[PDB]
Design an enzyme around this catalytic site. Structure first.
Site, PDB file in Angstrom:
ATOM      1  N   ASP C  25     102.480  88.779 -15.617  1.00 33.60           N
ATOM      2  CA  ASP C  25     103.591  87.968 -15.090  1.00 33.60           C
ATOM      3  C   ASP C  25     104.365  88.654 -13.969  1.00 33.60           C
ATOM      4  OD1 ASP C  25     103.022  85.879 -16.820  1.00 33.60           O
ATOM      5  OD2 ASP C  25     104.491  86.541 -18.339  1.00 33.60           O
ATOM      6  N   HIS C  73     104.397  83.953 -19.304  1.00 35.89           N
ATOM      7  CA  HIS C  73     103.765  83.843 -20.611  1.00 35.89           C
ATOM      8  C   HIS C  73     104.782  84.154 -21.702  1.00 35.89           C
ATOM      9  CE1 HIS C  73     100.243  84.549 -18.087  1.00 35.89           C
ATOM     10  NE2 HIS C  73      99.430  84.354 -19.110  1.00 35.89           N
TER      11      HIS C  73
END
EC number: 4.5.1.-
Lengths: 147, 153, 152
Positions: C25, C73
């Site tokens: 991420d 996520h």
């Protein structure tokens, strides 16, 4: 120390919390049945109160599973207070994504869990769960589907 | 062992991390205030910086609570780095769903927490929190509502 | 007892679980590479099977990072069973929100991780990961954007 016991207890209770979600999403009867004391009461507001492993299986088979093609619960924010070494009050939050068999409609659910756990002869299980549904939202024109 | 001490400190900090969210979402003034040192500093980018428990209550009562009819924070991915036995940096991710009072509008927010925790006299508390919002999305023909607002027109 | 060991093992595996996600991420190659063994197999059904810290970087740099402008996520429900005191099985659920480059499209993903973890010489890393994606759906009249984009 008594801290090692309390850390072992937290881990055990986080597993009961996760197991409940996993069992329902993955449709695992044994996993679901194993988390409840015989006298334990699982309540879903707007649906009812169910008692012990058999109650848990009743709710799953007869309501939850027929209600959804599939779903996923995302469990977070599990916060325990140890009343004693052997009983804990829990609160938790869940985000539920799924497809309702009825209307074949993608929904988002936001719910709060109010729980009680009990250790009996060295083993933690749920003694109580209340589930309150705060958001129940049909997702306008989106439909959850595999890739 | 400082292995147990590390494990026990992780747990308390996890509880700090959750408490903040619960106190905001469940509007619990006593839980909100209990997690900050007097010198602790809570910043939300685009909102401001507030200090100590009173600063926290100030933000909650005058900004956060009036902003939303309700909201819910889902905190995940708490990752800790122990600088010293009594000092830790944390990162975490949050998913927020809520209804804004302004326009009775449903929103999704994705934000990152950059945190510092401090242990004074066996008690852990926030020393700092920065909240940085990456997504801020009012929702289309979507309105978050309790299950009974279904079967209304 | 060695409860402490199992507890310490649980904590380290939890970090592994969250690092995989944070690395992807936040786009952190140092984090992404550090969590796999050299014989580690990371599979994402529908894509491929990459090996070790280097195939992990290969998957990142050439597939997922070019695939998204940004993503997040949210990992939850991590449940572990200990096979030995040095290897464990994990399952986990993930909620991924993101903007695909292709179409500049806001998407939601729901996925399951079937994981193995291995402890070698006092250090836990991913022995293996399987990523199975159950929902992968574009969200219609919705675009994930920084809050300032809301203004004029």
């Amino acid at each position: 120390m008594s801290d090692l016991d309390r850390l072992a207890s937290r881990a055990a209770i986080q597993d009961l919390y996760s197991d409940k979600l996993i069992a329902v999403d993955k449709r695992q009867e044994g996993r679901l049945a194993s988390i409840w004391w015989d006298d334990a009461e699982w309540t879903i507001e707007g649906i009812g109160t169910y008692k012990g492993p058999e109650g848990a299986l009743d709710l799953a088979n007869n309501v939850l599973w027929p209600m959804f093609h599939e779903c996923i619960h995302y469990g977070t924010n599990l916060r325990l207070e140890f009343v004693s070494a052997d009983k804990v009050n829990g609160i938790g939050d869940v985000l539920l994504l799924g497809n309702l068999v009825e209307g074949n409609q993608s929904i988002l659910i936001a719910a709060v869990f109010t729980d009680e756990y009990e250790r009996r002869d060295g083993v933690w299980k749920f003694s109580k769960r209340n589930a309150c549904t705060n958001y129940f939202t049909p997702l306008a024109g989106i439909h959850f589907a595999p890739p």
